[PDB]
Amino acid sequence: MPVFHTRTIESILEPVAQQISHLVIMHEEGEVDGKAIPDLTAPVSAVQAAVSNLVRVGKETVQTTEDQILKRDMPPAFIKVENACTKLVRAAQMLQADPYSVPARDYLIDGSRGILSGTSDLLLTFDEAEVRKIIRVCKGILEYLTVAEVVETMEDLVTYTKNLGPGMTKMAKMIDERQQELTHQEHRVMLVNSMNTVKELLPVLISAMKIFVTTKNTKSQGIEEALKNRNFTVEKMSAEINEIIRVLQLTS
């Protein structure tokens, strides 16, 4: 019903999801009473394989992960999908024998939904984890802004630009590829806008710091002013980063 979060997800689910609906509407206008429904055992023979292989892979994946939200969330989706296949398989059993079976109609129709739903749940949970990785980079950068306050030496500044430069760069790559990955356009701009504002400010922050350093080591006036514009740059920078963090978490 709602649009898919990511194109990758959507690629996997749009073609299928659609098919169900035709089936949902289509059953209401029964096309049997003569046409009947063929034997789809073969079709179900494979799904039941692909599904046990999703649980193996998913199962492999849960072990090989530091993430804990994924660990708890992911398992329910295995069984949702694995349970759902069973319904399909019975339905195909029922139809070997009574192509006209009414509950097998529903058994086709609910089982297929279950596979879709549960597979969506895997993809969203795995994604939710990708976003968290990005978020972490974000949060860590944020911390690195807080320490801009304590820099008072060109020697210190150089490490700090050397440290913080490639944090910034990583973050850039991540969000540029994440904005490409998402279906909604409104959210896309929110990221690109927000992240362009940041990329601009990095040089400004470096500058505003060099000005601070010099006045601190210059025994002169307007020391406060250089400080103000410093803090401001960091404030504004953080505002944008926390926005990126927040927009990354929108599904609505």
């Binding site: 996997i12 689910l13 073609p15 299928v16 098919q19 169900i20 089936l23 063929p38 789809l40 079709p43 179900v44 494979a46 799904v47 394989a49 692909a50 599904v51 292989n53 999703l54 193996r56 892979v57 998913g58 999908v81 399909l88 297929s112 596979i115 879709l116 597979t119 895997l122 993809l123 795995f126």
Partner: peptide, 16 residues
Amino acid sequence: LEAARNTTTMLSKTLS
């Protein structure tokens, strides 16, 4: 994550 594509395909194919 593409086992999920495999699944999505067998089910798709089944709908006939």
